[model samples]
Target: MDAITQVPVPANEPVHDYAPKSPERTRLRTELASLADHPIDLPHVIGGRHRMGDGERIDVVQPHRHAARLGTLTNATHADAAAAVEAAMSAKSDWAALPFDERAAVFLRAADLLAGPWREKIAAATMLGQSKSVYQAEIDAVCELIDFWRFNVAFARQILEQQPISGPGEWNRIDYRPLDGFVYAITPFNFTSIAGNLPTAPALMGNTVIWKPSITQTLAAYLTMQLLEAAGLPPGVINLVTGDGFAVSDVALADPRLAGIHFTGSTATFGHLWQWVGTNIGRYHSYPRLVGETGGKDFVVAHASARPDVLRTALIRGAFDYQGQKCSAVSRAFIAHSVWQRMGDELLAKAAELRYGDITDLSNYGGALIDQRAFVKNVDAIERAKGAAAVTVAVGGEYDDSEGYFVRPTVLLSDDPTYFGPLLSVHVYPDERYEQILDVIDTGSRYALTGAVIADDRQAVLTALDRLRFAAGNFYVNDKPTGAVVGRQPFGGARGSDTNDKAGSPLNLLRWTSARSIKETFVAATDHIYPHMAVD
Candidate 1:
């Protein structure tokens, strides 16, 4: 108990390239085929008990091939939500009382497990359920997930060692205690890693959690829960509920014991949650900590000095990769007229040819939108853009939802910034107006999540950094703004984005803890009289 220790040095997990003839490719293919062929029942894991919800059942299907069923889950009713809350509350005492190392070990073991045995399983589910290609699935469900677990353990250790200074004969210490009540984690469907992290991050800091994952993403979320159980996570420490969050939100928010909320979703939804929590301010034992990462109107600004190839590549990969579904995905770009002239034809050509199809076909760049709603949103945006005089369909405005929610990677050259859909909106500025254009890019969106500045000129780069400092939380100088590495670039933003609690570091961990400072005196004062009084 008296021993001092340090956690293993954290490193970014190596990304596996599922190339032809590679071992991982074979395994991934096997998993993809296996998952596609089988339909399973998804259940809520409450108090370590697995049961189907009593509410309406919904099918989880492949976005690329809607006919295929991946799994099914029911909307968690108010009763289910209340039971999950009770489970979390019941387990909080024991989980919080356990030694931090014991808790940390669970996630650490999980990281290894995923890196080894469970990698292909999770990757396959994310690919099939979310319609992500093998590469996207690898980076998200496998690499990033393992990184979050490993790096968070290392980050948590750093938090524990953050001790207070002692004076004279007194010993001072800080107790990073769990919150007064359980945390509610409302997860997004985009990344399997975010879904897992939203819940586990709070739990890692000794807080019990009730996780309500996006209905569409429950397949992987369910597997993630099983993986944690395999890693020896105690029952009720983290409870999993499935389906749309209506009843869960109603029940969780109304509970006086609700301690905090960890969320990643739409800006509107986050706002609704925030307003509701405020409306019922006096209902909680404590002011519930709200941490959310909402979607962003992410951008890319190209200086005249930017290399044409690099800018072109950045635009294509940043905007179109994963069908532009990522929260950090680049949805808008401001190009210097000179740079646009050089790369315009070629960029449009590539954009027109960028393949969108079923993910089971390994060669496609990406797949469909997450669901029909997302499909319609993009289609409507495209149709409206065509009729507008200021907007020109530069390339690829085709869409078809008959087979699945597929939207071609469109490029729109517009007089105005239309920050929506899977399409890339491009604005061409005069080469001389680089200074003036920086303002356009900064003020164009209410979001400040992620952005990139492509320029070879050091002065131009410096100017962008200074002028656009508040434009984005994660900014890239010459690289794409997406794919922030764990422990390297802690992800999150301010303004409309979220609480700006960087998820990949100790900063986010601090939010889950209610710190208490303690001081002990080895020697006691014999007299009540003060020294100043005696001297007088």
Candidate 2:
């Protein structure tokens, strides 16, 4: 069969609105209750089998209700990591030997499963376990993951179709092979879609994976595993090992067959992984592919001519959505003094209007942070800003964790633009200080993940486009930097943010594959005669 011509056209999955009395909302409410009512034991899925771990016990809890134990998984040790690697290696040959269409079918079925019957289940699990609002969960767990599975099939097919041109007497082709060994996918807790993508992207390309999802996100990950099996994905193709990544990294990084590391987490952890790989570079069978995306201090810059209401709404949604936990979430802002003076109070008022609590409640716009550690990190930034003389909490500065890890949306008025956090720093600059302010923002911040420039002035917008071109990998003209859709905006950045390998694009898939060129002669010369030797 012609792979390219036979493939279905891929499109982005439609995001669902779980509004009042909506069908999705009703389904989500029921699933939430059903999931919460039953507690299951989380186990490592290895070598096509489920095995309970006897190692250090790790509990998976609802972030919005920390006391509620959703399930429990064991902290995998070095031995367990070794077992996962062995399992991956043991099944590598047969799995990779399967036809490309067969491998693609598994994920395609998984996409269908996610889009139809399993949609509400995954979304509700994400909402309850990871503290995402119903809408947020729908986008991340259902829509985004569905998009990844479907589009990746299309992308991988496109890659397979890229063959070399040959002359009449000869033929040539390029074979896109998976990495020589297994891949380790270390995903964060914030987005279940990303957690699914990190491992499956490589697995789809024929590489087996050792996926270690964040402890807080184990529920959704487990559910995804169940879906994959039901969709007929062969076991050992993606070995799921749950808990913190320390033991896994320690063992996996030392192995000679460590082919790649796909990561999305803290900047410090990424740095450590890079350093570890480098230090052991000589011991590896091949130089491993290190693709990662780390933390960001994303920003939003508003011009003097920017509409007050637009800027205010941008600030609210960009910073507070998902509790400002997204890698692209805007943590800092630079607004023209006049514009800030006009809409500063309105920004505070709108933030106060946002309700945060358990995500099961469809009325709430946001929920708590992923865990206690995240709460502490955000609160520490707020407290530091409060102590600084140049910074003032404009509104919603309070935080209380009596019921859950709740930090009310807080705005910080600052003399310094260097401060970064969920607490937005409104650094009011003069109209003429546009260039100077941009300079400070570009040079002052270490991360270059995502940023937006809002301005009605054409030249002002153009100026920002030119001067701050390298300021962010995914830049916005007038909209907020958050909600980067797949395909449209392949999310990634350079300069300490990530390798700038654009996820959801062909560029990212290229990382998981290594190409081999083949050449064949159709006809052989009857006589062993060299034209150059005789004619010269």
Candidate 3:
């Protein structure tokens, strides 16, 4: 195939509002019913074959309804990990040899499938498995993942088309080669889109992948594997292994061919992987690339001139969306004392309006946290705030797990500006201390991912922009910090955040490839004769 004349101009898939009796709502409801009717058997896909793991059997259940078992998978042992690595290696050569167009076509077709026939099914799975609300699921599982696939194709083409400049007598070109060894993609449960992207991005660049999705996200991840197969993705291009990832990490990190790791998970885990890779550096064929996005203590700061209604809405949506599970979700807030008095009551009242229950109830704003562990952690954080002398629960600080792991959207008011929590916290400071507060907020947290500042004053807005420039990777002015668009705001953070490599951008794709320069001379010299020799 000749080089593509033009790649498709990528566009974001529209998010469904799920209005009453809307077509999107009907389709989603129908799909949810179908999935509930037929419980799936989640299995590991190695070398294009589905097989059971030898380790202990584990049941994947609904986060909102823990009594219900939606599917079952198993822990992968060292043997399973080795098999997945071998399968990825075996398929690597053929995959890499395929023309770039063909590789791009597979993902493009998958994106279409996701946008059309497969949309509702995947969205429903995300809601059921990951406990995302209808809108959240649509944004994450359907729209964002489709954007990732489409944009990556366009980005990869641009990379391949980049050529070297030559003056005369020679032609030079640049080849974007996939990494020499297999990539290990460890995905998180929060975004089904991210889970799809982590492995597929490297695979699109012609590298084979060993994808280990979170056990909590296996239902949606399993559905995605089926969709990719239906889209005619060749076997062994991406081998899936499900479990706690202990065995997979042990085997993969020790392997000499380990080329890269694309991860979105906890800060501690990423650090451990990095340290292990450094420790075993001499044992590998080449140094492995580590690309990761970890934890964030994201914030939303309000100036005295901010509108009460706007501040109220931003806090409710930014902090409570997806139950504050997103790394970009607002965990801490700084509010001027004057604005706090005006908007404080409204913020508490609106937060109380947020309903948390089973995702099946479409009327509810949110479902449970991803698992029991997350629920306990959040409960502990709320309890500590309640006990603190400087903190007061403004509204909604209760938790109930009788049916599911449900914690009310809690809001804490604190005098301490440095307070961070699983729930949202408002730190009231005097108007005169706005500049001082900015400095404290900037230095308060180690993670810099996403944050927002709402202020009507032009000077205040500009000042916050300059001071908080390094505070968040994706910063917002007069708006909520969450819901970052794919192409618009390529997302990631610095400092404690991983690598600052923005996902869903060309930069992230660059991490998966190695560039080679080719030079061909039109004519060659037969002998070593030069003007300098004649002078000598």
Candidate 4:
């Protein structure tokens, strides 16, 4: 747990002395270059065939620029979504019939494959297709996906094998059952690993999933499918369909046989899906599950004792990583008045240092915003912040990728707590301006996903955690508000931020199964003794 010992080198090709102690990293670099131009095609493992429909062609653009096609995606229609649903229906019976050990084996194979040759293509595809920087793509390809697979294997075993006890004078047994239908995963474009997890985790636990991969992450998702197939997952267990959100949602949700939905996106969409489910609940023959992690305004609080240097890293990683595209990205912060001057100066300097360029660049820090919509939003936010009585600090540099969606790293230092904005996350301080800051917190919009306080002092940290109650998913101590890990901190939230369905621990595994109890008694009479006559 001691900081995870930097990062592991994660591919087969070797680099000749890339950096100090970077032999492994050099190999990954070479391996990525090898797969730079691999052609992408959709894989539908339904019933074991790589089949396709008359789906429309969708162009995938570089996340760093609004350029020509890196590749094409198949825009599935309602019929395609239903076919995936049917594939799940076909696979469900056999999967449910298999013993837990057998089901667990399939996931184990996939986990091992994730750690092997497939690692390079997955990372490389993310770089070329989604415009993820080398480091970010590597995290998805090597770190997070490996972790998700390993974690899913362990968690699935725990769910499928768990047993329960009965009270005295009774003999009882319990069985965990998978749902009768499919779990449909509709994911977002910000993180490629999400495409693997939202569907695959349910699949690992003896269920089938039909994931509609985000268009921004088509290549990453396709490579993941290849890895899953190579891992020996049976056909019809995992399926893929892609389309506009509503088209995918309508087909998946309207199916009376559909088991559940696992979603990650905006609060509005989540609410709409939830309403649709509620409206149709009575019409369905079986109960369906719904799980979600919606939008939130995550927070970071820097206290008086916070180290400017440490705070700087937290802020940079939280705000600038992936160009602030993550749901966990921090949009606001409250630096303590005592260190405000130094903090502002340091943050601005770091912001100025951010390099915006092609994502393939090893040193590119701020890649293009996911698209022009996000680009305009980010630019507009900075411009609006400039109007407030706040020091709109900058690090002597600006974003230059005007042809696409480049966003310069930016920060706003303000004493005017009265100003309200719709940034996804924000940081606040409660010093002399405590009253105004408190009002800002109260009046803020209701997207509560995560919050953090940076303080060596235990009481300050505790007090802040207890009182500053905007976040629903995560609370941090002396740290910024990103880096939600599995095993230790699986992500979930309350109220609007999430369904409060914690997604990574043993408890999360429990949610995936339904428990049934069996009871038996030893004092049984012989049944042949005129049983029919006695009943008559």
Candidate 5:
């Protein structure tokens, strides 16, 4: 185990009641434990509904915290997928025809519901579905989703309405229109907020959505929409579905009604979907819009100016947050030699304090990875690095737990630049080697999600930022590059990183709308042939 350091416990507040030993949490535990036969809510297609088909199902396990069973999800068939698409397409006109302010009003009510009635259920579902500690569940599942809804409400207004222009004897206009079809929101298991927003944001913009929540995160996402339903969102605007990859893809990609895709998951999956769309593009009424945020092996670079305290905070917060399941999880670090010694000591201490048992444990740092497969993969990646010829030092022991998927936070070092540095690697550079450290990460692959630099000296930090200018969509100063603020900062990448279709910012409004300019000459057009010949 790495050495452990304890962070000051936050002030106890009503918020802490989220994990209280009260009846709700206990009732939730009891209910989950007893739900052996209850089918997992899989496809929530058009109108907060559920259905089954395809003659297959997937098991959803409640790992680590308890050897408990949540439920199973029905695999969606081609017909079911088509039903979801038709449902979304059928509902599109009615939802889009509503006034912009009315759309924003619905999301506002959804925000209220999330903050109120659905809060505890979401927190509990996160614990059961993802095995996240109560604190982790609160932040990721409850608070963030509430925040996202409020954000969409505020952000939508600016996007939906056109700006009025004025000049004497002159006229101008701008109007944003929908892309003429539905958005397919394919999301991941790690973050329900990401999954919920995939469809919710576009739906708020008047585009109907066919949402395929991750099989692992089905329950939580379903419950979120229950809150949305309570908020009185129009039925069928937010559709949900689940099934084998090919089955769902067959429905989503094959339909010409498909307007776009918003995905958060693996690069491989993204590539396959992109190809599938390309293959089918000729048959569509309009070219399909593709937007995504795929996988990442993000990094943090520390400079001589960095202090031990700051380095400790960044590492403790970045690497282990959500058990490192975040796409922006800090997998690698490039530490300056001047601060490495203190960083190592502080990190060791912090790692020691981390406790793993049940996600419901408020005292624990976090819970295990979603399941054993993730644990095994991360452990295998570390083990292979141990055998790599350039591996210089390997800290943190091999994962030993068998009951559930749990791996200790790992740390490693390698001198060879070409070794590919297992998942997330760290490098300690002497102050003189700053430029070399910057040069090392650009190793001929197509991935540039995010990076960070920590330094006490402003110029040194700025210089490092400049040196590695084109490598990331998000670059941070003097901190770890993770935990983005919703709606304030835009999140997404350019180049191999993503389509740069940013989420959580005011800019995201444009993703759901199209530019359809409607104009006529200021002069009377009774003759219907006066546009090009006259200026007004």
Candidate 6:
């Protein structure tokens, strides 16, 4: 259908409670059981067809219980990457030639299908395969992905409608052409929404993609490909290559057809990818656009006038939710001594009681880290804090990997920040030194991803908003910094947090296109002489 029309502006997707005995809860349980009972093969999707990798085989298991295999995947090799790249390049012209509405319909239909039929299955896959609680999965896998699809359609349409002003004799318009070549979208294991968003966002702008999802996230990632296929996504628009990105990176970076990289991973990885691109800049046809959201030493600062309960809630939800695996998860906090005196004990006590268990058990607050590597990282941080003279583990510093990669939500009373997992380092500062502490926060971390200021005082909030303005990209007032919704709060950060392209909004979508301003004269010019030249 080549019919031209405006895409409806969609509302942010409503998250399901998944409360006990609710219809959604029942369906979720059924899907969860079904996924847990069966183990399947996760293969690469090249040109809309499945092709098994010929490299090392790896087991995809539930993080809460490593004994249960969710699926099996082979490490994608250089050959696999080459095939994916070829498919994307082969299909690029046709894909880019399709009308914007046609491309928009695929993601819009995907949003509707996810909201209706495929909600629980993807939610269940995210829960079991990636170890997110039902609520987390509902927010991330089901709702956020829906929001990305629906809202992005409207955002992209808005971009298309932004034409240059025309003169009386000429028609001026902008042609939003897709990039010169294919994009490499490397997704993380934490958010299924991101896994779906990274590749699809570029595809929405009419660019073909070679997606390399995290190994731990492959189950849901593969399922996401299936979902897009059902949404009528054409072959090679977004190709899936599974397992560690080593071979894919090598093959993709070397290919002159590489157009861009949409990534979410470690700062170190992003740094390496950037360095590699820089070193090989002379080999590419077009400059490869690099966008990434890496780790964050996200902070939560409280003033003396802050409400104790509000402070407690922010710390609990921001620091511990998703086992602190989120890029926006609060990892560092600076609290006024007076406020800490009031809520410190209660916050620690509440954190201690919060259970980390199998997510299938809805009763648990959250689940384990994505893998042993994350578990070990948290454990090492805790151990180092324990030994340090300036630091004290205030509550629930424990780890047990006998069954699953579990680590208790821990609060350390130290400003020395450790990131990327369930570890929140707190430092109590003098009540009178709020301004000085603000400066400390500004200079402390190299990351500027997310931060929040908990204060009832209007002056103090403004103080933070001004003094530490650039300290955080997604700044919050009295609330936690995590759980940024699509369209509502466009997310990204700078200063070691990778490029601040603002995902889930038009800023991100704009990166995938190269605009051409066209001005066509209605009548031919008889002479080349200008008015100024004639006067002279």
List the candidates' TM-scores in order.
0.97, 0.96, 0.97, 0.86, 0.87, 0.96
**Residue clash pairs of candidate 6:** none
Q: Model 4: residues >4 Å from true position, as ranges?
A: 1-21, 43-45, 167-170, 386-403, 418-445, 469-472, 491-498, 524-536
Give Cα distance to truth, residue 286, candidate 3, Å.
1.7
**What is the per-residue lDDT of model 1 for residues 1-536, given as tens digits with 9 covering 90 to 100?**
89988888888899988888899988988988888888889999999999998999999999988988999998999999999999999999999999989999999999999999999999999999998998999899899999999988998899888899899999999999989998999998899999999999999989999999997788999999999999999999999999889999999999999899998888789889999999998999999999867777678989999999999999998999899988768878889999999999999999988888998899999999998888889988999989999999989999998998899999998886433346898999888998888887677646767878999999999999999887777789898888877877876574455465847778889999999999999997988988788754
Across 213-284, the per-residue lDDT of candidate 2 in tens digits comes to 989899999999999999998879999998787898999999999999999888788889999999999999
- lDDT (Cα atoms) of all candidates against the true structure: 0.89, 0.85, 0.87, 0.67, 0.71, 0.89
* Residue 94 error, candidate 1, Å: 1.9
TM-score of 4: 0.86
User: Candidates ranked by lDDT, best first?
Assistant: 6, 1, 3, 2, 5, 4
Q: 1-536, model 6: which lDDT tens digit per residue?
A: 55668787799888899887789999998999998999999999999989888989999999999999999998999999999999999888888888888889999999999999999999999999889999899999999999988988998999988888888999998999899989999998889998899999999999999999999999999989999999999999999999899999999999998899999888788889999999999999999999868766688889999999999999999999988888678888889999999998999999999999999899999999899888888888888989998899899889999899999999988854335778888988889999988888888746767878999999999999898887777789989988888877876585545454757778899999999998899996899987888754
Residue 184 lDDT (model 4): 84
Error of 4 at 270 (Å): 1.1
Report the C-alpha displacement of residue 295, candidate 4, in angstroms: 2.4
Per-residue accuracy of model 4 over 1-536 as CA lDDT, tens digit each: 23312112222222122233575456657755555544445544455566555677777767676664566666777777777888888888887777666676665677667666666667767876666676667665556767776676666655554567766667887777777677888888767777788887777668887888777777677777777777777878878776455576777788887788888877777788889999989866667787767666566777677787788788888877776766667777777777665676666666777786776566676467776666666666766666655554444214444566666766655545431111322344555554355345546636657777777877777767666655345787767687665666675574344354645565555556667888886665666676467755
Candidate 2: worst 10 consecutive residues by lDDT?
A: 416-425
Cα RMSD to the true fold for all candidates? 1.5, 1.9, 1.7, 6.4, 7.8, 1.8
Collision pairs in model 2: none
**How should the candidates be ordered by TM-score, best one leading?**
1, 3, 6, 2, 5, 4
Pairs in clash, predicted candidate 4: 331-425, 332-425, 332-426, 332-427, 333-426, 333-427, 333-428, 334-427, 334-428
